[PDB]
Amino acid sequence: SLAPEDGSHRPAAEPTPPGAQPTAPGSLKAPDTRNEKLNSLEDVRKGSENYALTTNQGVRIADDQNSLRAGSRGPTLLEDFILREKITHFDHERIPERIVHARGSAAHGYFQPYKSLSDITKADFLSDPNKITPVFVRFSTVQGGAGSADTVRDIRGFATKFYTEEGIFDLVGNNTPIFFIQDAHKFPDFVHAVKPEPHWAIPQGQSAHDTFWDYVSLQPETLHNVMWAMSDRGIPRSYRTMEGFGIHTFRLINAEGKATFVRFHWKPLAGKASLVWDEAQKLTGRDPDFHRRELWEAIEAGDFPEYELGFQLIPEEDEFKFDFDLLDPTKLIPEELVPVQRVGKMVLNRNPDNFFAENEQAAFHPGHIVPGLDFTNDPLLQGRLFSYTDTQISRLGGPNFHEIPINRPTCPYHNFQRDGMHRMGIDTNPANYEPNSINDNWPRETPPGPKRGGFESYQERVEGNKVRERSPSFGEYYSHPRLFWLSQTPFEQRHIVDGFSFALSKVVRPYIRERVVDQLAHIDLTLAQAVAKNLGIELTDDQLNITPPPDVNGLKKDPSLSLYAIPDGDVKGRVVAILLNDEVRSADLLAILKALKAKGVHAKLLYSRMGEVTADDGTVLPIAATFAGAPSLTVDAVIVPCGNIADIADNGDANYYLMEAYKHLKPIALAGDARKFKATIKIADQGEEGIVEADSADGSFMDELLTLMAAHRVWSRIPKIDKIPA
Amino acid sequence: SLAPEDGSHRPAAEPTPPGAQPTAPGSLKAPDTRNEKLNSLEDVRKGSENYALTTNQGVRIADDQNSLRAGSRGPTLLEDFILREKITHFDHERIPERIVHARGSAAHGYFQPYKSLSDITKADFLSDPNKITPVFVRFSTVQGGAGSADTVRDIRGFATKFYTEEGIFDLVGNNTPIFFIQDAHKFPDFVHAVKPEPHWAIPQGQSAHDTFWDYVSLQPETLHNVMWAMSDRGIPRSYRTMEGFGIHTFRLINAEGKATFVRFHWKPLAGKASLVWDEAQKLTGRDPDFHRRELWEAIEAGDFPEYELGFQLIPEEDEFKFDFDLLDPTKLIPEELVPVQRVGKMVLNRNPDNFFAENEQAAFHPGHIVPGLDFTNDPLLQGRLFSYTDTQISRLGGPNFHEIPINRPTCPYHNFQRDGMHRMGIDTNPANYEPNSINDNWPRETPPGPKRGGFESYQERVEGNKVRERSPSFGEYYSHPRLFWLSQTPFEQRHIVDGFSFALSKVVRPYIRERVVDQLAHIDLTLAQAVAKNLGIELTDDQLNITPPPDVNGLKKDPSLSLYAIPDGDVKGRVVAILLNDEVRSADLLAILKALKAKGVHAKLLYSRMGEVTADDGTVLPIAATFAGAPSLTVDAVIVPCGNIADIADNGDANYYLMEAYKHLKPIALAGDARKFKATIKIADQGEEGIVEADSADGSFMDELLTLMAAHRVWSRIPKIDKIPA
Ligand code: HEM
Ligand code: HEM
C-alpha cells in the first residue's frame, strides 16, 4: 500500500476547474456520462484496482522488480519468459503515425438535429430531433509529427465520426473553408513541400521554409488557403474557438431521389478566437500541449465544447450560377451569397480513457458516408476517397481496423469478408460468398428506400473523354484571396502582413521571396507593398500597375470571413492569472474570485514560490504556480489585487508577467497599490482603454474586466506595444 | 526552366558558414568527402538532374498535375495507375518511431586509434593507428517523439556504429555516466513513468509531471541520474559540447585471453557547455530543431564535431575493490579513482543525403560487438541485449534490417539464414544448412585467434541459484548523488536546485513533492532545504537529522563531474549576433569580422527588417534575420557596432534582444554610441565584468569579447539578473 492515507492521490469524480485536481481517464472522472458508443466499449475496458499483476497469459507475477539470473550478480537467463514478454510488448508499442494530422486531440460526445431534415436528405441521423448520435471528434494540426507542438501556425483538422444507426459517417474537415490544392494528384507534392525538408528533416511544425514557399510561388491555386494560414486563423486560441468546414461540395439525397449540393460547417458556440503570433510561438516552447490540455480540462470542468452543424445548400439547377466552380476546393461559397442553415448541435462531454487505444488508433475517412449523402466530382475529394482506406492498411496493421473498438459501428454489420491480420469476428455463416443457397443467401442485399435501405449512388450524368486535364473553370486564383483580405479588420490585415513577412524572412533563397511578393501584387497592392517593405523589396512599376482581380459575385467583402469583425465573444471557460503578494487584501480577492466564478471564468493564483500565502485577515491562499511556471501566455487576462505590493514590485518575473500580457493585447486590472505597476507598462496617469484600475476590486472593477474579456483582446493597444521591450 | 538564371537556387559545394547558403544533402555539399562506408552507399544513391519523371516501374509521366477523369469536370477513374501508385506510396511513407530516443540527429565520419591497443584488446578497429574505421553517429533525446523539440531537459543518447573489418560494433551510449535504473525488467516501468501519461498523452519532451516523480520517489536508485538531469547536463548547448558514456562495464579481451573491465567515454574536443533553463525552454518554442540544425550547419562549415574515445580500465582482480558494484549502472567510476586513458579520435565530417533513409532507418544495438570485446553481467546491459534485436523486427519491417543500406557491414557477411520480408540478397549457395557436404561446408566456422578469428565468449565463472533477486551490493542510492552535488560549482548547484524546484512545482499531487524532498534530505540537507523553500515545504526535525551518506572511496568531490569547474572552452564554431543600424560604422565592422574570423567564430547580421542596409562607406550588408526572427537564444554573444544608433536606440525588439542575452549570461560588446544601451540593462558607468565597451571596436575590444566567449557564460552576473524584467 503506497497511496497517501488521506486519499489525495485520486481526483474527485465530479466536475472541477483546471488545475484543481489531477486529470484522469474519462470513465473514472465522469462515470455517469454515458452514450451508446461509450457503453458499447465496456466489453473491452479493463480495470486494475484489487487485481493481481499477471503476464498476458494470466500467470501471476511474484517479483516484477528483477530478471531471473544465475546468482544475484549473474547473467540473465533465456528462460525468463516474464521479462521477455514484458520487454517484447514494450519493444513493439509504436505504430506508424498518421501521414498528415499526426498531432491531434480527441473526445467523445453526442449530436442531435434541431428538426427533421427528411425533405432534403434521407440520412437517418438527421431524420428526428429526438435521435441522439454518439460522436468521437479528433482535432489536429497538419504538418508536425505526433510529438510536435499544438500552437504552431498551421491549418487545423476537425474530424467527426458519427456512429449512426445506418452506418458510420465521418465528416473529415479543417478549420478553413478551402484547401491549398485542386487535384488530389498533387497532394504528395504539396505535403512534401510543407513537411520538413528531406535532407535534414527541418523544420517541424512550420511552413516557414524555402520548399513551401517555392511550391506556393509556382502554384497560385494555393494562395487562398495560404492567406487564411497567414492570418490569425492559423493560430487558434483553442479547438473550442475555431470554425470547421467540410471544404468540398457534397450531395444530400432525399427519399424522392432529389440531390441538393451541400457544404458542411461547424460554428463554435464559444465563438471565434485566436492567439497573436509572438504568444503562439512562445507557447509552443512553454506548453507544447496547450490545446490538448485545454480541451481535456474544459471537458473535466463541464465547459463542454459545443458546435452547431450548418449546411450551405445550393439546388442542382444553380450549379453554374457563381463566378467560381462549386467543385473547386480552393474556392469558398460566401455566406452573403448562400447562408448557412442551422442543422443541429454537437456537445463533446467525455475524454477518452486511453489516448493510444482511442485517439491514436481512431480512423476517420471521408468515404465513410451513409444513404442520404453522396459525393461530387470535386477532384480533390475524389482522390481522398482512395487514400484513407489505403493508408489505414499499414497504419493500423491490416484490413480489420474496423474491429479496433473505437472504430466499430454501433449498428449491425454482416458480410462475406473473412480473414486478415488480427481478425476478431468469428463468422458462423456456412457461406462466405453470395449468391449462396447453403445459408439461403444471408446476409442479403437491401434495395434503396426512404429509410433502412441499401446505398445507391445518385445517377449523375458523366460525359467527356478520358483526360488528365484541369477544368478551365478552376483556373482563377486571386479573387478569393482578395475577398478574404478585404473582409478582415485593419488589425487582422496587419497580422496577415506580419505573417507573410515573418514567414518569407525564413526563406533563405531571396528570389523565392520576390516571387511570392509578385503573387501578392496580384491579390492586393496594399498587402504586397506592406510585405515588400518588411522584406526590403521595392515593387516594380509593372507590379504597381497590376489590375486587381474581380469581386466575387459582386462582393467586395463578407464579414463572416473575419474572426473579430462581428463580436461573438464568450468568457466561460477562459482563465485569469491573479498575481498574489504576501499580504493580499482579502476583500479584493473575495470580490474578484466570486465575479469570475459567476461567469464561469477560471482563476490561477500565482506567486514567487509554491505553498501558501496568508491574506490581511488570515485567510490561507493556496498557490497554483509560480510567475515563471505559469506564464501569461497560458491565460486570457491578468488581475493584480492590492496588499503588500512591495513584496512583488521589484520581482522581475512579476513585472515581465505584466509586460508580456500587455504586449499580447490581454486585459489587465490593477486594484489599489497594484496601480504602481502602471510604470512597468508605461500607462498614463489618466489611464488607458484596456487597463482596468480602481482603488479596490469592488463596484464596477470586475464588470469592466469581464467586458474586456468578452472582446478577447485590446486591439487598440497595437500601436502602443512597440515602445515596450518584451 | 524554373530555376533563377543567376544560379542562386544551388548552394556552393564548398564549406560555408551557417546561413550563407541553403543547406543541402551531404553528397552534393561535400562531394569530395569520402570514406569506405560513404562509397559503399553509391549503389543506392539516386540523382535527378536531366532525368525524366517516371512511375516506380520506369514509365515516363506526361502530366503530373492531374488525375485521369471522364471529362475535365468528371469523376476520377480507377484505371489511373499513375495517381494510385503516387498516392499509395505517400499513404505508406511512415514507419513506427523508435520506442525511446525517437528524436535524433545523425552524421557520417571516421575514427582512428592513437596507438595500437593489442596488449589489452584484439579488436581489429583498435589495432593500428593508421587503419581508419568509418562511423555513423546518431545523437538523441529520450522521451519525446520524432517531432518533439531538441532543447528539452532530458538525457541525450550518443550512439556510434563502427563499420569494422571484423564486423559492425555499435557503442550505444548517453551523455551521463549512469542510468536511472538497475535491472532491465524495470525499463518499461521507468519509461512509462517518464513518457506522456496514458490517459491524455501529456506532456511531450518533459519529465516534469506526476508519474515521473511518483516513480522516482518510490525508486531511490533513480536519484543519481535524476541529479544529472536536473543539472545543466540536461540542457546541452550542442551535441558537440556534451560528454558520452557507455555507462556499463564491458570487457576487453586480448589475444592471450586476458579480460580487462572497461567503461567507455567520449570527450568533446569543443569542450563542455550547456544552456540555462529559461533559454533552453524558450528555444524549444523559437527553434525546436536547434540541435539538429547546429549539428548540420557545423558540418557544412567545416566545424566538424570531434570526440576523443577514452577507456577507464579496471583489472579483473580489482572487481570488488570499490565501495560500489562495478556492475551497477546507477554508479559511476570517479576519474579521481580510475583515470580515463585516451584511445582515439572520431571526426563527423559529412551529413547524410536523406534523413529518412539514413537516420530514421539506422539500427544501433549494444549487442553488436566484435572479437576483442565482451559483456559483463550488469543486469541492465543483459536485458538490453534482448530488446534491440526484438524492436527492430517491427520498426524496420522484418529480420532483413541489416540489408537496409545504412545498416550494412562493409566487411564480408555470409551465412545460412534465408528469406524474410524484403529479402535483398540472392544466395547462390546450394546449401542453406551446415554441416553440409554439398557445398563442402562453406561458409565455414573460424576458430578464435589473435586476429580474424571467430567470436568466443570469455569463460566467466557462473555460480549461484536461479533467482529473481537484486544484488545486495546495489542497494545504496545516495552516495553518488551526493558526490555529484558536492563536485558542482556554486552556480551549477543553484541551477540544480532550480531544476528540481521547477519540476516539482508542476507535480499536482503535493504528497509526491514531499516524498521527493524527503529523498533529497538523504543526499544533502543544503540541497533539500533550498528545494523545500521554493516549494513552501518545511523540513521536519527528523529530516534535518538524517546522516549524510558516506564519501565514495574517500572522495569529497571529483571536479571531472562538473561542466565548468575546470576551464575547457573552445570558441571555434560559436556564433555572435551583430545588431546593425542603417549607417553602420564600417571600421567597427571590419575590426569585428576580422577578429571573429581569426578564431573561427561565425556572425549573424540582424536588423529591424530583411533586405540590405548600407554602411557609412557604401558597403551593402545583407541582413540574415530580424531582431525578432533570430533571437538572442540562438547565439553565444551579442555585438552592437556604432553608426546611427538613433535608428535602433528606441526599437523595442533591439532593447529586448540585449535584455534576454544579459539574463541568459551571454557576453555583450558595445562600441561607441552603442554604449547608450548600457541603460536598458542597468550597467554602471564604470562598466561590469561581462560587458565589453570602448569608443570603437579595436583589437583590444575583440580580444576581451573573445576571452568572455571562451568562458562560455558570465556566471558572476547571476545575482544581477533577477531584477531584469525579461
Ligand atoms: C479538403 C481537403 C482535406 C481535408 C479537409 C482533410 C482533412 C484531414 C483530417 C482532418 C485528417 C485527420 C483525421 C484524424 O484526425 O485522424 C486527415 C488525415 C489524412 N488525410 Fe486528409 N484532408 C484533405 C485532403 C487530403 C488529400 C487530397 C489526401 C490524399 C489524396 C488526404 C490524405 C490523408 C491521409 C492519408 C490521412 C491520414 C489518415 C489516417 O492515417 O487515418 N487528405 N485529413
Ligand atoms: C545504459 C542504459 C541505456 C543506454 C545508454 C541506452 C541508449 C540508447 C540510445 C542512445 C538509443 C538510440 C539509438 C539510436 O540513435 O537509434 C536507444 C534506443 C533504444 N533502447 Fe536503449 N539505452 C539504455 C537502456 C535500455 C534498456 C534497459 C532497454 C530495454 C531493455 C533499452 C531499449 C531500447 C530500445 C527498444 C531502443 C530503440 C532501438 C531501435 O528502435 O532501434 N534501452 N537506447
Side-chain angles (χ1 to χ4, degrees):
Chain A
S1 185
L2 300 179
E5 219 117 43
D6 70 3
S8 58
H9 59 299
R10 173 78 52 181
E14 63 187 32
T16 51
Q21 311 260 164
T23 57
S27 72
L28 302 184
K29 179 62 178 183
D32 299 334
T33 295
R34 302 308 305 161
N35 75 37
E36 177 182 355
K37 176 66 180 183
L38 287 169
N39 293 344
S40 79
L41 291 174
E42 201 55 51
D43 69 327
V44 297
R45 279 198 183 88
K46 296 188 70 65
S48 54
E49 299 181 51
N50 312 310
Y51 288 115
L53 175 66
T54 63
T55 68
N56 295 326
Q57 310 285 326
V59 166
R60 291 184 171 199
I61 287 168
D63 184 355
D64 190 50
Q65 316 312 312
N66 290 291
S67 306
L68 181 70
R69 31 176 161 278
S72 62
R73 298 185 70 254
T76 299
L77 303 189
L78 191 62
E79 75 191 77
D80 193 346
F81 61 98
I82 294 172
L83 168 74
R84 280 188 290 89
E85 180 195 82
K86 182 182 184 179
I87 301 298
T88 291
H89 198 282
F90 172 79
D91 284 345
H92 291 293
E93 281 182 13
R94 303 296 175 264
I95 69 176
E97 74 180 15
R98 293 156 173 72
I99 186 87
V100 283
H101 299 255
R103 173 69 185 178
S105 297
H108 290 274
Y110 67 98
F111 170 80
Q112 187 166 4
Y114 293 140
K115 69 170 187 171
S116 175
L117 300 184
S118 295
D119 297 340
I120 61 180
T121 174
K122 63 176 178 185
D124 186 61
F125 76 107
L126 295 168
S127 70
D128 178 350
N130 293 311
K131 201 179 292 256
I132 290 167
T133 294
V135 300
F136 188 65
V137 173
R138 186 168 178 279
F139 301 105
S140 50
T141 63
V142 176
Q143 191 260 40
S148 70
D150 281 337
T151 62
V152 293
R153 181 178 297 285
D154 203 354
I155 300 303
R156 304 307 198 271
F158 186 158
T160 301
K161 178 167 300 293
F162 289 87
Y163 297 92
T164 94
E165 294 176 15
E166 296 190 6
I168 294 297
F169 166 43
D170 294 329
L171 179 49
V172 186
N174 287 340
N175 74 333
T176 69
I178 68 291
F179 203 57
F180 292 100
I181 59 164
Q182 291 178 342
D183 186 310
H185 197 65
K186 303 290 304 167
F187 190 70
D189 293 308
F190 173 79
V191 167
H192 285 189
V194 76
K195 286 271 185 173
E197 299 191 12
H199 57 299
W200 62 350
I202 289 181
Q204 200 68 215
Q206 292 166 73
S207 62
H209 60 107
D210 285 53
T211 57
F212 177 74
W213 294 100
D214 194 36
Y215 185 95
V216 164
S217 77
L218 305 168
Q219 290 287 270
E221 75 196 55
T222 59
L223 285 161
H224 189 194
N225 212 201
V226 169
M227 295 290 309
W228 285 71
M230 293 301 111
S231 76
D232 286 355
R233 294 273 183 163
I235 45 173
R237 162 65 176 79
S238 165
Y239 298 137
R240 299 190 300 105
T241 66
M242 69 189 194
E243 287 183 307
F245 305 90
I247 293 178
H248 314 291
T249 302
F250 290 84
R251 291 173 166 113
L252 302 181
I253 304 301
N254 73 10
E256 286 65 41
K258 180 174 82 165
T260 300
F261 293 117
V262 58
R263 288 202 184 181
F264 299 121
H265 285 252
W266 289 119
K267 174 183 172 172
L269 297 181
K272 296 182 280 177
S274 283
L275 307 175
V276 302
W277 171 249
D278 182 60
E279 170 196 19
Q281 190 187 32
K282 288 178 84 171
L283 192 47
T284 66
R286 295 307 193 186
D287 184 2
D289 302 306
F290 181 77
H291 287 157
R292 180 171 288 175
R293 191 192 307 283
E294 201 256 8
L295 172 65
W296 188 280
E297 295 181 334
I299 286 168
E300 285 205 352
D303 299 322
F304 302 139
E306 300 193 4
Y307 302 88
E308 178 170 88
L309 183 62
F311 292 172
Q312 284 178 299
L313 292 168
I314 294 185
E316 191 171 57
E317 331 73 89
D318 290 3
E319 183 167 7
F320 299 108
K321 289 184 189 172
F322 303 84
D323 283 345
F324 54 87
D325 196 315
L326 298 183
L327 303 180
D328 179 351
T330 65
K331 299 295 182 293
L332 56 77
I333 303 177
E335 291 180 46
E336 285 295 313
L337 308 186
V338 179
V340 174
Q341 291 192 59
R342 307 165 42 274
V343 163
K345 187 161 80 150
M346 177 168 69
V347 179
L348 302 187
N349 62 2
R350 221 203 70 189
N351 293 310
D353 284 312
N354 184 266
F355 180 102
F356 179 92
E358 292 170 86
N359 176 323
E360 189 66 24
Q361 295 192 130
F364 298 87
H365 175 78
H368 291 163
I369 61 166
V370 297
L373 306 182
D374 212 340
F375 308 119
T376 67
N377 292 331
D378 169 321
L380 189 72
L381 171 62
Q382 286 275 312
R384 285 180 79 198
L385 300 183
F386 171 81
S387 172
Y388 297 69
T389 295
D390 176 47
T391 201
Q392 283 162 6
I393 296 308
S394 61
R395 185 168 75 85
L396 297 176
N400 291 309
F401 59 86
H402 65 287
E403 300 186 312
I404 295 175
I406 192 71
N407 293 323
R408 298 184 298 198
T410 59
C411 63
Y413 106 79
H414 295 86
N415 58 44
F416 299 97
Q417 300 185 28
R418 296 289 180 267
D419 306 354
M421 195 63 80
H422 207 110
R423 180 70 186 186
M424 296 299 292
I426 300 176
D427 285 286
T428 62
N429 194 340
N432 63 178
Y433 58 97
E434 68 81 12
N436 72 74
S437 66
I438 66 169
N439 199 43
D440 206 10
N441 212 28
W442 294 106
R444 292 184 184 172
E445 292 154 287
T446 307
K451 293 218 188 55
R452 299 283 200 277
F455 188 89
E456 184 177 89
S457 288
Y458 177 70
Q459 289 194 34
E460 177 173 22
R461 169 102 182 311
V462 178
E463 195 228 280
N465 285 334
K466 295 190 182 177
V467 289
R468 286 179 174 87
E469 181 176 350
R470 202 73 64 79
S471 183
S473 59
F474 281 43
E476 191 289 312
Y477 308 120
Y478 302 123
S479 70
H480 282 49
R482 177 174 182 79
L483 173 68
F484 180 81
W485 168 254
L486 294 169
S487 299
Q488 303 313 298
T489 63
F491 57 91
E492 280 180 312
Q493 284 186 341
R494 170 85 270 223
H495 290 176
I496 290 164
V497 165
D498 292 345
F500 277 105
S501 297
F502 170 83
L504 288 173
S505 83
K506 298 301 175 86
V507 167
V508 180
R509 290 168 179 92
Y511 69 93
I512 290 176
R513 310 180 194 160
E514 294 163 10
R515 289 171 178 194
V516 180
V517 164
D518 192 62
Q519 300 271 192
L520 299 181
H522 292 79
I523 294 171
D524 178 83
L525 168 68
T526 302
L527 166 57
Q529 287 183 117
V531 174
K533 175 178 172 147
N534 284 334
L535 296 173
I537 292 173
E538 269 177 58
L539 301 185
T540 66
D541 282 354
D542 287 330
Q543 290 173 318
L544 288 173
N545 287 316
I546 294 167
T547 117
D551 299 336
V552 178
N553 292 94
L555 296 178
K556 293 150 144 30
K557 63 154 157 278
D558 186 328
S560 57
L561 302 184
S562 175
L563 286 163
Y564 296 122
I566 306 316
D568 67 2
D570 180 342
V571 298
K572 178 168 193 275
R574 297 294 184 104
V575 63
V576 179
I578 294 171
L579 310 191
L580 297 181
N581 60 84
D582 64 1
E583 198 177 35
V584 175
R585 197 163 42 159
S586 55
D588 274 348
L589 225 215
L590 287 179
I592 292 161
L593 295 170
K594 203 179 185 186
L596 294 179
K597 184 244 260 311
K599 296 312 177 281
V601 178
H602 299 122
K604 61 170 71 154
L605 306 181
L606 303 186
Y607 193 48
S608 49
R609 63 159 168 75
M610 297 293 284
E612 290 162 349
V613 289
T614 302
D616 61 357
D617 74 337
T619 304
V620 171
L621 283 355
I623 295 149
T626 56
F627 306 126
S632 76
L633 308 169
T634 65
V635 302
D636 294 289
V638 184
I639 300 180
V640 187
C642 193
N644 180 211
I645 299 282
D647 178 38
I648 58 162
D650 309 303
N651 175 307
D653 289 343
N655 283 290
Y656 182 69
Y657 204 99
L658 299 171
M659 296 170 77
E660 188 183 67
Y662 189 76
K663 180 187 181 180
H664 290 158
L665 321 174
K666 290 166 178 177
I668 290 162
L670 302 177
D673 293 346
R675 291 168 293 191
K676 286 170 162 114
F677 284 113
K678 284 169 76 166
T680 304
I681 38 176
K682 321 275 209 207
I683 309 308
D685 291 358
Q686 135 278 307
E688 80 173 40
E689 292 311 327
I691 299 299
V692 180
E693 49 182 288
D695 287 346
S696 71
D698 86 333
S700 60
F701 179 100
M702 291 304 301
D703 287 334
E704 284 154 24
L705 183 274
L706 285 153
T707 291
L708 294 171
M709 292 188 73
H712 176 58
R713 301 286 169 92
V714 183
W715 313 116
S716 65
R717 191 190 294 167
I718 286 167
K720 291 96 138 264
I721 69 175
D722 294 350
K723 45 118 227 65
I724 134 185
Chain B
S1 185
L2 308 180
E5 227 165 52
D6 65 6
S8 56
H9 55 119
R10 168 83 40 184
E14 281 299 274
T16 50
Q21 294 287 293
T23 57
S27 70
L28 303 183
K29 185 59 179 182
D32 300 320
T33 295
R34 293 172 178 286
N35 73 40
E36 181 172 16
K37 176 71 183 180
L38 286 168
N39 300 339
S40 77
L41 291 173
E42 194 65 30
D43 60 333
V44 295
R45 288 198 179 88
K46 185 157 276 173
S48 57
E49 299 179 41
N50 302 310
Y51 290 116
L53 172 64
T54 68
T55 70
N56 298 323
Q57 304 292 324
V59 166
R60 293 180 165 191
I61 287 168
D63 181 0
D64 197 43
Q65 318 307 317
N66 290 290
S67 303
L68 182 71
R69 31 176 161 276
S72 67
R73 296 188 70 250
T76 300
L77 303 187
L78 191 66
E79 73 187 79
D80 192 346
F81 65 101
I82 297 169
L83 171 68
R84 279 183 293 89
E85 181 196 78
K86 184 182 186 179
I87 298 298
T88 293
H89 203 280
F90 169 77
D91 286 345
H92 295 293
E93 285 183 3
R94 300 295 173 267
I95 69 174
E97 72 181 18
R98 291 162 172 75
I99 183 84
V100 286
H101 297 260
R103 171 75 186 175
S105 301
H108 288 275
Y110 70 97
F111 167 81
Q112 61 194 115
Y114 292 137
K115 67 181 202 173
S116 177
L117 298 182
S118 59
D119 289 346
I120 58 175
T121 177
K122 59 181 176 178
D124 182 64
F125 81 104
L126 295 171
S127 71
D128 183 337
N130 298 298
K131 201 158 57 158
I132 287 171
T133 299
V135 300
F136 188 70
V137 172
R138 187 170 179 281
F139 300 104
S140 54
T141 63
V142 180
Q143 191 259 37
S148 65
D150 281 336
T151 59
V152 292
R153 178 177 299 285
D154 200 351
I155 302 300
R156 303 309 195 273
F158 186 158
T160 300
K161 176 171 300 292
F162 295 82
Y163 296 90
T164 97
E165 295 184 7
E166 292 191 5
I168 282 178
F169 166 45
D170 296 327
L171 193 183
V172 187
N174 283 342
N175 70 339
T176 68
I178 69 292
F179 201 56
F180 291 100
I181 61 167
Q182 288 181 340
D183 185 310
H185 194 71
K186 298 230 38 96
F187 192 68
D189 294 305
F190 174 77
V191 171
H192 282 187
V194 78
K195 283 270 180 175
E197 298 194 10
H199 56 298
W200 62 350
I202 292 181
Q204 201 66 214
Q206 293 164 70
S207 58
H209 60 105
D210 288 49
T211 58
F212 175 70
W213 291 102
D214 191 38
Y215 186 98
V216 165
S217 75
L218 299 171
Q219 295 286 270
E221 75 193 59
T222 66
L223 287 162
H224 188 190
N225 211 205
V226 169
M227 292 295 307
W228 286 72
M230 293 299 110
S231 84
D232 290 350
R233 300 269 181 164
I235 46 177
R237 159 69 178 73
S238 171
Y239 296 138
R240 307 183 298 99
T241 71
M242 71 188 193
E243 291 181 305
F245 303 90
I247 292 177
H248 312 292
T249 303
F250 287 85
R251 290 173 166 115
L252 301 179
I253 310 298
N254 72 12
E256 260 83 38
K258 183 174 76 166
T260 299
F261 290 116
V262 58
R263 289 201 181 185
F264 303 124
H265 286 249
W266 290 117
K267 164 178 293 193
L269 299 182
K272 294 177 287 183
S274 285
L275 306 181
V276 298
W277 167 247
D278 183 58
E279 169 197 22
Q281 190 189 26
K282 290 178 79 179
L283 198 39
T284 69
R286 295 311 190 181
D287 183 5
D289 305 304
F290 180 73
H291 284 156
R292 182 170 289 176
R293 185 188 312 284
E294 200 254 14
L295 170 68
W296 193 282
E297 290 183 328
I299 290 172
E300 292 206 344
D303 298 326
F304 300 138
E306 300 179 284
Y307 303 89
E308 175 167 276
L309 184 64
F311 292 170
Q312 285 179 292
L313 294 170
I314 296 187
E316 184 168 63
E317 69 271 12
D318 288 355
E319 182 173 2
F320 294 100
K321 289 177 192 171
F322 299 87
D323 275 354
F324 55 90
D325 197 313
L326 290 183
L327 297 184
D328 180 354
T330 62
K331 303 294 182 294
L332 60 72
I333 305 177
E335 296 180 47
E336 285 293 317
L337 309 180
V338 175
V340 177
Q341 172 187 151
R342 68 197 304 267
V343 162
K345 185 167 72 167
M346 179 167 66
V347 175
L348 302 183
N349 67 351
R350 223 200 71 187
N351 290 310
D353 288 307
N354 183 268
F355 182 100
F356 177 91
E358 292 170 86
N359 176 325
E360 189 70 20
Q361 298 191 129
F364 300 82
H365 179 74
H368 291 168
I369 57 167
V370 294
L373 307 179
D374 210 338
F375 306 120
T376 64
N377 293 328
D378 166 327
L380 193 72
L381 167 66
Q382 283 276 316
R384 284 182 77 198
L385 304 181
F386 170 77
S387 172
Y388 299 64
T389 309
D390 175 45
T391 197
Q392 284 160 7
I393 298 306
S394 58
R395 186 170 73 84
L396 300 173
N400 291 309
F401 61 82
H402 65 285
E403 302 188 308
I404 294 176
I406 190 67
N407 295 323
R408 296 184 299 195
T410 55
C411 56
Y413 106 77
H414 296 83
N415 58 42
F416 298 94
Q417 299 183 29
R418 298 289 180 267
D419 308 353
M421 192 70 77
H422 203 105
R423 179 66 181 187
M424 297 294 292
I426 295 178
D427 284 288
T428 61
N429 194 339
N432 67 176
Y433 56 95
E434 64 81 13
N436 70 75
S437 71
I438 71 175
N439 198 48
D440 206 10
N441 213 18
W442 295 103
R444 289 182 188 174
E445 290 159 291
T446 303
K451 295 171 206 73
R452 296 287 191 279
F455 182 89
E456 182 176 269
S457 289
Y458 178 67
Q459 296 178 46
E460 189 171 9
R461 182 71 181 171
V462 180
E463 289 184 11
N465 291 85
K466 297 190 177 177
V467 287
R468 286 179 175 82
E469 181 184 342
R470 199 78 62 77
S471 181
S473 61
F474 281 41
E476 193 287 314
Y477 308 123
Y478 303 121
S479 61
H480 286 227
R482 179 174 182 75
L483 173 65
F484 181 78
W485 166 259
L486 288 178
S487 301
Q488 303 312 114
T489 67
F491 56 93
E492 279 175 313
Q493 291 181 335
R494 174 206 295 267
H495 292 175
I496 288 164
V497 167
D498 296 346
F500 277 103
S501 301
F502 169 86
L504 294 170
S505 82
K506 300 306 195 82
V507 170
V508 178
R509 288 171 184 83
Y511 65 93
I512 289 179
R513 310 183 197 146
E514 292 157 11
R515 288 172 179 191
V516 173
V517 167
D518 188 66
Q519 295 277 9
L520 298 183
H522 291 75
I523 295 163
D524 181 79
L525 172 64
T526 302
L527 167 64
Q529 283 189 132
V531 176
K533 190 185 165 142
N534 285 328
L535 298 170
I537 288 165
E538 177 168 340
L539 295 195
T540 66
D541 274 347
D542 281 356
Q543 285 171 323
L544 290 163
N545 297 317
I546 297 169
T547 298
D551 293 338
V552 174
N553 287 100
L555 300 175
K556 300 233 157 270
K557 72 176 58 182
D558 184 327
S560 64
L561 302 186
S562 170
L563 286 165
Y564 300 126
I566 298 168
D568 70 358
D570 179 347
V571 302
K572 181 167 190 284
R574 297 289 192 106
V575 58
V576 183
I578 299 177
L579 307 197
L580 300 179
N581 63 74
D582 71 356
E583 191 89 337
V584 175
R585 184 158 43 148
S586 66
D588 278 346
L589 193 65
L590 250 53
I592 292 161
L593 304 178
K594 167 155 200 281
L596 295 182
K597 192 174 103 104
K599 293 300 188 57
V601 174
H602 298 302
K604 67 169 75 160
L605 300 187
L606 305 185
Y607 191 57
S608 52
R609 57 157 170 85
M610 294 299 286
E612 290 164 351
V613 286
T614 300
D616 64 358
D617 68 347
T619 299
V620 179
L621 296 173
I623 294 156
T626 63
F627 302 132
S632 79
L633 305 172
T634 71
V635 302
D636 299 287
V638 187
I639 301 175
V640 188
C642 196
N644 186 25
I645 290 303
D647 178 35
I648 59 161
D650 303 318
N651 180 293
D653 279 354
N655 281 284
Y656 186 71
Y657 202 104
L658 298 170
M659 295 169 84
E660 187 181 72
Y662 190 79
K663 182 181 175 188
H664 292 155
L665 317 177
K666 286 166 186 181
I668 293 165
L670 308 167
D673 281 1
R675 294 169 294 182
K676 294 173 199 306
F677 285 111
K678 283 166 77 166
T680 305
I681 50 165
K682 321 274 211 208
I683 310 307
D685 282 356
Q686 77 154 9
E688 192 170 276
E689 289 309 293
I691 308 298
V692 177
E693 43 183 295
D695 293 338
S696 77
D698 39 48
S700 174
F701 177 96
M702 291 304 301
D703 283 345
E704 274 185 70
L705 188 254
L706 295 151
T707 294
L708 293 175
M709 290 186 76
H712 178 53
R713 300 283 173 92
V714 187
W715 316 113
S716 62
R717 197 189 283 165
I718 287 168
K720 297 143 216 267
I721 76 170
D722 260 26
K723 72 174 152 51
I724 52 56

